[PDB]
Structure formats: structure tokens, C-alpha cells
Amino acid sequence: MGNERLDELRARVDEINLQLLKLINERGRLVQEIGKIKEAQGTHRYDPVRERKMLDLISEHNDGPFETSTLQHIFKEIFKAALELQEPENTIVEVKGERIGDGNQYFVMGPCAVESYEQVAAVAEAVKKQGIKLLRGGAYKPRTSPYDFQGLGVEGLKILKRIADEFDLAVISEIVTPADIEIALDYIDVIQIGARNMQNFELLKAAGQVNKPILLKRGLAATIEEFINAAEYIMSQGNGQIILCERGIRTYERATRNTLDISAVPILKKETHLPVFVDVTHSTGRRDLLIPCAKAALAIGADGVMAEVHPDPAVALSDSAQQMDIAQFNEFMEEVRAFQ
Amino acid sequence: NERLDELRARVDEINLQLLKLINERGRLVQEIGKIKEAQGTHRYDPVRERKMLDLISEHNDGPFETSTLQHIFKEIFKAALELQEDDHRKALLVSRKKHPENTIVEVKGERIGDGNQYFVMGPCAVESYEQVAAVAEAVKKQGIKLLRGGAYKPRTSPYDFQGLGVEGLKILKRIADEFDLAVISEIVTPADIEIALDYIDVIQIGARNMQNFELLKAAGQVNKPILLKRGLAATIEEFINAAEYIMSQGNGQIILCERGIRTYERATRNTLDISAVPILKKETHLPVFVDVTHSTGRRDLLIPCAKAALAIGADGVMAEVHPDPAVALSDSAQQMDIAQFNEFMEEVRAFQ
Amino acid sequence: NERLDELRARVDEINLQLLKLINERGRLVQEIGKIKEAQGTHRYDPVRERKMLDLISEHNDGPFETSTLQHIFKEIFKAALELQEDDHRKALLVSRKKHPENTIVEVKGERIGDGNQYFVMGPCAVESYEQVAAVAEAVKKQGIKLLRGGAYKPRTSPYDFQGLGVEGLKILKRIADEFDLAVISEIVTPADIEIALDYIDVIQIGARNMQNFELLKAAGQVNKPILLKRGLAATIEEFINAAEYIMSQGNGQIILCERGIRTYERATRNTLDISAVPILKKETHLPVFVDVTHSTGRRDLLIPCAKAALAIGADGVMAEVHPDPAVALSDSAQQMDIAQFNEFMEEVRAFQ
Amino acid sequence: MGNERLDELRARVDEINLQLLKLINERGRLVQEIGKIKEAQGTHRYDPVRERKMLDLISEHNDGPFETSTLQHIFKEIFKAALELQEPENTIVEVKGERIGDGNQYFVMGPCAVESYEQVAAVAEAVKKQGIKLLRGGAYKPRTSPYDFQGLGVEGLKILKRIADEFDLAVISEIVTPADIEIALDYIDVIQIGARNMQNFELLKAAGQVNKPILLKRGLAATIEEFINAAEYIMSQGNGQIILCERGIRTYERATRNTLDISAVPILKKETHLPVFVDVTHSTGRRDLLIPCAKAALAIGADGVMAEVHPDPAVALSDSAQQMDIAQFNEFMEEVRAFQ
Ligand SMILES: O=C(O)C(=O)C[C@]1(C(=O)O)C=C[C@@H](O)C=C1
Ligand SMILES: O=C(O)C(=O)C[C@]1(C(=O)O)C=C[C@@H](O)C=C1
Ligand SMILES: O=C(O)C(=O)C[C@]1(C(=O)O)C=C[C@@H](O)C=C1
Ligand SMILES: O=C(O)C(=O)C[C@]1(C(=O)O)C=C[C@@H](O)C=C1
Ligand SMILES: [Mn+2]
Ligand SMILES: [Mn+2]
């Protein structure tokens, strides 16, 4: 039975959106032409006098529904864009044979921080036995308290490369400054951007410019819109090898470190066609939730799950209470293995 | 520059074409809002938006990147949404647009929202006659007319003190008469509304009950000032709409109280949202108070926050006083003893 | 290394001295908790903490920086606080520690929390016999026993459809009998609890009423399963404590429903908190459901989220179905039409 | 009348805290000694085998109240600190005669972004006439959307220095990367760290190492604890010239861009003895709230208020809807001036 009149009103709106689309772009072309003319004379692209003059035209005789302040905002967005302009199936990221976003489901495992060769070695052996190809380790660790461990740094990356080769593993690590992006290309297989750096644009650029998979974590308090925009930044600069990781978001809830937002996954999968992972360790911040949340994450259709393993977590240098020991890790794997 | 002028000429011609389509779009959107408002469907539809943005994306060949156009078009949809929201707010009895002049609530001679600034003071919970008596004496000496006390207390634990209940209301009426005070208390269920009319001068609805709609209705149906506290996690829109439930039932004697909102921040019990005050004062014609004790949850902030609240133009400030807070049965760490209260008063005497 | 050993020997000796003081400290803290729990004062006192940290700061000459010691001592105070919190949780009737074995609620043959997984399905609001009839037929064909419908609807606007009320409950009872279904509905005020017993099989408390304590009590006092939805902005602690109000009154037939929580995120009506489920299942002995329709507020997420919810070990999933959602009087964009529902069922058939 | 027994229990607890304080520090000394011994042999500071051995001792016969997992966490914090260790009246910041945190109340004013000489000049003239010494401008602007303006950069700093000299003003600007810290010393009087960079530790260090006032904005979603820790980082590295700015925090509320947290001010003032400012423009995100919120902020005892002014905001390149035009600014000043 339905609503004939709502549909037709919406039809009309759509039909207007296309008319708008066409005009904005013809406007675009004209703007390009103008830039060429201006730039030839060596005249600045941005003209606030000209903008004000155009806004005055828009503002005259406004008896449409909107406030004038509002219209000007709309038209201002248009002029911004004009200025900036003067100057679909699923993405796959192969890393060492893993075709992430193949539709299959991958696991990343390894210690929070890299602390020694023998440390990481211990883990690598254990994970390889679990048929995991993707290992992750913190060569650099972003550090909120004053007695936190910053990372071994390059010595870290060396250790990972060593392990990578030795054990036939793809190895993943966070990098924290544009300088170090370049350096890491030689040691690691995927570069991670931590959540605190989701809006470190310098770094994003830097990563946008290499031939390397990027693992971009969603910010502590980032909207999805924002997260997407950060990814599009990397891509817009050449690098389309991007994996998104949900890792929880910050809420009033104290039972959990962060609040895991599984809704994000299908949404991100739908709106970008990048693969999306979930970090069960840093979202919950709780050993007891790791397994359940992994399942959840698989069910909902994440491309992979990421968690942290360390041979003696009680003495680790980061995340003592969050990491799985190797026993805990094997139990964990048996149980999501049985997610069949 | 002959050619730059002539290019701008044409751009102008387009801006008008755009202007006209944006506005026609506006109108259709209003038509939709009316439908949505009738049938009670949420104003904001992200599934719908993404469907519209996919068409834009399926039909873009022009020069601008798709991510960029989508940004532009979102700003349009935002504005379309705000148009609807402002359209519904226009017609509410709680808005200034409906009732421009600002509402006054007389209680025992206090003309709240007259432009002056009033204080509500008293213990969190009513525990005994003598307890409240103690406080009342102290406050009266500070020229305060408005006393508040918890006849009923909503509680996180059911094993925590729930209130003396009616015995509570009796004690307050007694004090009211004895001390010539207007006396305020929270009531928690529609049944008890009726009963309280005999004892107290303003009925408070606690934050946890902001969306207990039956209680609202019940309160909407009496001849009594209501003091409506904003919910733990309520948008302003919502808070306003709860005030609408009350006015819609006949009662327009409503005072809004900001009392903080819930955030990730642990240093403070809640996060006091001072922005709300001038907003509520702009968007409605009701007086607005602030509860400094429950928002901060901290003795050390009571004073500062009161000043802040006066400065920003609150119609009043509300706080909690109790003769021995160490043994109080609620808010033992938050309440002012009588000394603390007199220090507090001397210091905000100086902010009107 | 002769000297390293002998230095470590001494460090060990200190670790024990520390161990012993930390524990004695623990005990004193428990003693304080008992006092605080008696008199109903908040467990966490930042003013108190800062007073303690100032002493540490006023007396530090040893080698460690003050900012560093304070960090250590905070971790101690955290643990002292958690000790109290876990002490109070121990003794609640809602905890596993009290009632280790897990609670079962039989409703019309469904043994909820038996370990199997149940589905609740039906329209947001009850609008007509034929409306609900339509849905009931469809769900029964999907082997579902548990039907839910809104006899009363809490609403942001008082001008939005509030519910048919009793006529609603009548319609549901009719359907229940006609179709051999257990039928669920929200009730919104203590008065109406009593009345509903005759019509429906489970009483729901909406999220906005999680801290409507009178309603809780009212529900605590009947022989009826209760479906308690977690508040918009409720901590887990709180949600559990609201379930305590009910059990404390006699009724232990309680089902907890997660239905999202409120966050800065606008893409979703609320943010579904899947973490809660296994937590609630660990910390209490009650079954836990998820409402996928109200948490996401999005047709496109209904399926995924259901799977997620089953996987994580929810005792059930609850969603909304309506024969023409475009004209529904609530949730027009959220509800599944019957096709959508059958697609939905075929796909989660495959997750138990 | 009171609670004699609660007081005495608390007394006892305090008396224990001091006993703990004394032992942790004697432990500290011993640890220092050990480091010297280890480092002489050229042995790594961190010994996970040794830590596990100590944790096993702690864990044996636990019939105190705490779980073992918990005790180990406590003791782990202690060992962390021991490892890191191997290796009060109010602060005043003079800038160009302003004795910020003098107890008086200062204003910072100026445009969001620096766009041209004449632009900033326009503003500077207007503010100087309002007796303001502190001018702020965005040489670098951190940039969430893809058509946002990044800043003129150095050309920006030059322009500010020019204005500073010309108009006898102290001039403030955000800097976004450690490299640029050094450069800016020559152009500006206070360096701002934006909120998105509150936990960019690289940058903090860099700023911790200069002789320059720093204006540190609190992060989008930062606890107070975190904000403080970021400040202590700068200080711990030499620079104690720090001004904290509250600028709102991110909440579910859509009527306001962010939610202004005035509670923070007195708290920060109490807990650090740094001056604290409030940014009324970026917290509310609303022209209509600027004035009220300024008052609030003054009342509550902020050391200063910061807001944004621009000669034609409708055409500005950032914050079009938030900035005050010069009229609006004068009205604004008259009204907080009348905060007497
Ligand atoms: O007309 C011009 O001078 C342009 O560069 C184009 C345009 C426009 O969008 O029209 C855009 C940016 C300028 O600041 C002014 C206007
Ligand atoms: O078509 C609708 O559903 C509308 O209300 C219109 C509209 C728009 O089209 O702007 C506005 C807000 C909604 O969130 C979706 C789209
Ligand atoms: O003395 C108190 O108020 C306590 O409950 C003890 C204690 C502690 O001392 O750990 C713990 C929690 C409070 O937030 C403050 C301090
Ligand atoms: O005993 C040692 O070897 C130390 O360096 C001291 C210490 C301790 O804190 O005892 C701290 C860190 C080391 O990882 C082991 C223990
Ligand atoms: Mn980690
Ligand atoms: Mn700005």
C-alpha cells in the first residue's frame, strides 16, 4: 500500500540533486579556465573581495526557506572547492601471499611491543604453528604516561625483518613520523598508523607516497566520516593499499578500556571497499573478552582480527594485563578455528 | 583583465541557477518533513543519504572529485535537515518563536525569570525535622526563600536510602510554614504528584525521570511549578521536548535545570555544560537554573561554578547544604556544611 | 655478578614489605567501603585522592619524581576502589557470585537462557489487529514463538504516536491466543503493570525507564517475566543495579537487553555495544538479548549485527517487523517488511 | 557530631601511604645502584626473567584481599618506574610585558588562519584599539576535510613577525611539526600546540626544548589526567612556560560543535599551577555563545579568553560561521569590558 506522495517527492529531490551536480561541475570548468588566466598573470588564486561580492548576490531577495547565513555557508563550501580545484568492487592487499579482503578472513598476531629478538622469536614460532602469516610488533609505541616505553625504534625494525625472513612471515609495525616511513620500507611489510595519529596528516601524506600496504587505525574519538576522510587522503596521494582497523572508541563506560564498535565494520566495508580489521585487544582491553569479540568480529564479516600475544605478559613492557600468553593464544585459536 | 570579468559574469549567472535549485529543494524537503512529522519517523536518514550520494557518485563526470562533491552535498542535506528541525521547533509551546515573552514562575513571592537571579538551597535528602530545620535557619539568614529537600531520592542502589517519602513531604510543609519558605522536592511517580500538592511549592522531576513520560504528564496536569532536570544523557532537543509534554498538558510553570551531562571525564561526576544555559534561554521562553552540586560532584568547584553560572546569565543556582555532611545519607562528600555555605554565599553575593 | 645478586636479595626483601603494606591498606579500605556502603556515599572521591596525593608530594625526597610516584599511588587507589566495587557486587542477588547457576525464564515453553538462542520479532508499535496479525502469521511460519508489540510507546515528541494503550494489550492477547504465541510489550507506568498481567507474557521496560525505580519496583512485585532494557547512557554497573531493584522485590524472571548506547557517532542512531553481552553473562546469572533494530537504527545493519550478536553468545536477538514499514507510525525506516524478514531469517538460520 | 571511626581509618591509610612512599624510594636507591652495576658490565637494563621471578614471590600465599593479577599489576608499575629511573605558587609567563597568570585576565584575539598581510593587518589595528596585546593567527592549520586550507606556512610566520613589529604586538601561532619549532622562534612569541597534537610527543619534546612560551590545547577527547601528563612532558624537558587552553571536548551534543567544559579550569588551576585559558570560539562553535561563554570563563577564574576575529568571516578560509567580524568583536569587547 505505501506512500505514493513521499516517493514522488523524493524522486523530485533526486532529480534536483542531479541538476545541481551538473551545474556545480560546469561551474567547475569555468573555474578551471579562470585559474589558468589568473595564474598566467601571476595573481593570487583566492579573492575574498570577489567572494563577498558573489555572496551579496546570493543574499539579495532571499524568500526561499533558508536563512541567508545558511545559504552563504553552502555557497562558501562551493567556492572552497573551486579554489582547491585550482593547482566499484573490493580492494585486495597482497602481503606475502595473503590476499586480504579476498573474502577470506585473516589474523594478525604478535606482541604489543618489540622488546628483544628472543621475545619476538618465541611468539613467531607459536603463531606460525597456528598457521598465521601476519605478525605484528611495536617498533615504535605511542606513549601516554611518563614511565611508558617508547620503542626500540630501528633496532626494532631490524629485529622484525630478521624474524620475517627467518620464519617466512609478513611483519607489521607502527611508524610514527614521516621521516621513518622511508626507512621502514626495507624492514617491514605493512605500515601501521596508530589511532593517535589518524589525523597526523604529515604522516598520512608520507604513507600515501610509498608502495606499501598501510594499516590505518581509527582515532580514539573519530567519526566514521573522519576516518574515511583520513583514508581518502592516503589514496588521493597514490597509495590505495589500505587496511582499516576498528579498535574501539572512547565512551563513558569504565568496564571496558574502550567501547568496541562493531557497527563500524559493515559500514566501512560498504562505504569504502577497503578491507577492515578489528583489534580485539585494544578495544576491550580485557583478556576475558578477546575470544567473544573475535567471533563477533568474524561473524559480522570483518576481513580479519588482530590481537596481541607475548610469552610472559605479566612482565611485558606494555599491555601487561591485555596480552595473551602462548597458552592463552592457543586456546584462543582453537576456539575461533572452531568458527569453522 | 577583460577575460576574467567576462568569466565571472557567467559564474554569477550560474550561482543564481544554483540558488534557485537549492531553494526549490528546500521546499520539497519541507513537504517531506511534514510527512515525517505526521507519521513520527526520525528526521535523519543516513541510509537515505548514502542512497542519494551514490547517485551523485554514479553520475559524476564533471571535473570535481566525487569525495569533494559528496562533501558539498552533505552540507546541503545538513541544511535541509536543520530546516525541518527548526520548523518543528517553531510550533512548540516551549519555544520563544511561539511565546516570545519570557515565562515567569511566582512561588511565594519569588518571580523566577523576572531577570533577577535566585538561589535554591538545602539538603540532598530529608532525614529528620531537626536536620532540615538546621539548614532552613541558616538559609533564611542568607535571605534565601527557596529551599529544597529530598522527600524521595532516586538511587543507583535499591539498598541506598530511598527517602522518607510522605513523612518527608510533611516535614517540609512544616518547615515551609514555620520558616516562611518555599519548599521544593522531587517526586518520582504519578501517584505521588497529587499527594504532594498539599505539602510543597515546587515539584522537581529528577534527571533520571526526564523521560518518564507518565510522570511528566501527571505533572502537566496540576496547578504547580515544576522543576525539570535535564537527563544524564539528554540532547537539548530532547530536554525541550520533555518540557513540551508538560506544557502540552496545561502546565506552563516550568523551570529547567542544567545539572551536567555524562562524559568520558572521571575527574568530575558529570561534566557541567554551561553552554546549555544561554541556549535554553534563547530557544525557549523558560527560566533556567544550574545545579552546581550534582554536575561537578565536588565541594571545591561549587563556588567557581556558581559564579560561572551567574555570569552566563542563569536564572538561578541550586546547591546542597546539610549541617553535618559527613554523616549525611546521600552526597556526604558534596554537600556544604553551614560554614561552607556562608563562605559560599559571601563569595557569590559578589556575582548577583 | 656477586653484587647484582646481593642487591636483588635486598630488593626482594623490600617487595615483601611492600606486599604486606599494600594488603593491610586493602583491609582498611574494605572497612571504609562498608561504611560508605552503609551510608550511601559514592565509592570514588577525587577530592580525597588529591588530598592523599598532596601528602605524598609534600613528603617525597626519595629519588623518584613526584609525577611518577603519583602515578604509582593512583594505580593503588584504583585497585582499592575496584576491591570495594567487587565487594558490593559479590552480594547482589543479580551476581553470579551469589547465584552461580544461571537463571532460566520459561515463557510459553521457551526456556530462555537454557543455552539455546531465541528470537523476538514483531512491530515497533501496535497499530491495528490486522497489522499485527500479518506479522504474527509471518513469524510463526519462521518458527518463532516470541512476538513483541508496542502497546505503549515512549516518544521523544509528545505529539508522536504514544500507543493504543489497553486496546493495544487486548489486541496482543487476542493474537497470543489465536496464533499460540508468547507476546511481549512495554509498559510505562506502575499503574499499568497490574492491568497487563491479564494480557501479556512478558513485560518490557524501555531504556528510558531503566531508572524509573517505581516502575521497577512495580514489576518486581508480580509473577511475570521482565525484559529490562539498558538505558541510553547507563553504565553496566547501573544496569545491573536496576536489575537488583526488581529481584530485591521478589521477581527474579529477568531478561536483560542490550540495545546500544549513546555516543558522538552519528552514522548510527546508537552505538551497539557488543562487549556488554559476555560481560553481563559473566557478571550476572541472567539471560541477555540484543535489540539490533534500536541499537543501529539501520535496516542495512540488521543482519550483520544479528550474527554478531549470536556469535558472541547472546541468549537472543530481537528485531522489528511490520508489513508496510513505509507507513508505520514509528520506525518507518528501521523495520523489516515481511520479505526483508524472511531474507533475514534464512541468513541467520545459518548462525543458530 | 561526625564520623570518628571513618576519620581514624583514613588517618591510618594516610599513615600507610607514607610508609609506602618511604619504601618505594629506598627501593629506588637500590635500583639506581644496580643500574650502575649492570651498565658497567654493559648488560641490558630490562630483565623479564628477573621480573617474573619477583612476581612469583609476590604471588605466593596471597590471602590479602586483592587478586593476584591485581598485585602483579601494582608491582609491575613499580618495576616500570624503576626501569625508567635508570638513565608551590603560580607560574607566570611574560610575553611582551603581559604577565599571564599574574592573577589578571588576558585576551587573545585574531583570525583563525592567516591568509594575507592586509587581512591580519585589518584585525591587528582593530584589536590594538581594544587594548589587546596578544594576537593569534594560523600559520599552520590542522585540516580534517580534503578541500581544507593547510596554512601559508612560513610565509605565514613572516607575516606575523611583520605585524608583531609594526603594531607592537605579541603574536601567537600553531606549529605542527618538530622541524618547524626551531624556525618559528624567530617569528613568533608563543607557540601553540593544537588539540589534535596534544599527544604528538615528538612535537611536545621539540617544544620542551626551547626557550619559548607554549600554548597547549587540550585534546578532543582527553581526560584531564592526560592533558596534565602532556604538559608535564614539556616541563620535564626544561620548558616550564606553558599555558593550558581548554577548548571543549567531544560529546553526543549536536547543538554545539564541542561541549565547553568549564569545570576543567579551576581544576587545572588547582592541580598544576599553570595559567589556563579558554577558547570560546572552537569550544561552542557558535557566534551567539561567544559572549556568554567568555563571561562564564572569566567568572570561573580563567587566566584568559581566546577568540577569533576576521574582517569578513563569511569569506574566510576557515571557520566562516564562527569568527567575529570587527563590529561583532567591538560589541564583544564592550560587554566583557563591562565585566569590570
Ligand atoms: O572568480 C574567481 O576569481 C575564482 O578564483 C573563483 C572563485 C569562485 O569560486 O568563483 C573561487 C575562489 C575565489 O576566492 C573566488 C571565487
Ligand atoms: O528524503 C528524506 O528522507 C528527507 O528528509 C530529506 C533529506 C534530504 O534529502 O536532505 C534530509 C534528511 C534525511 O536525513 C535524508 C534526506
Ligand atoms: O578514603 C576513602 O574515601 C576511600 O574510599 C579510599 C580510597 C583510597 O583511599 O583508595 C579509595 C577510593 C576513593 O575514591 C578515595 C580513596
Ligand atoms: O633487578 C634488576 O635487574 C633491575 O634492573 C631492577 C628491576 C626492579 O625493578 O627490580 C626493574 C627492572 C628490571 O626489568 C628488573 C627489575
Ligand atoms: Mn598493545
Ligand atoms: Mn578557528
UniProtKB/TrEMBL annotation, chains A, D:
The keyword Isomerase applies. Coiled coil: none annotated. Keywords: Isomerase, Metal-binding, Transferase. Mn(2+) binds at C112, H282, E308, D319. Its EC number is 2.5.1.54, 5.4.99.5. This is 3-deoxy-D-arabino-heptulosonate 7-phosphate synthase, chorismate mutase-isozyme 3.
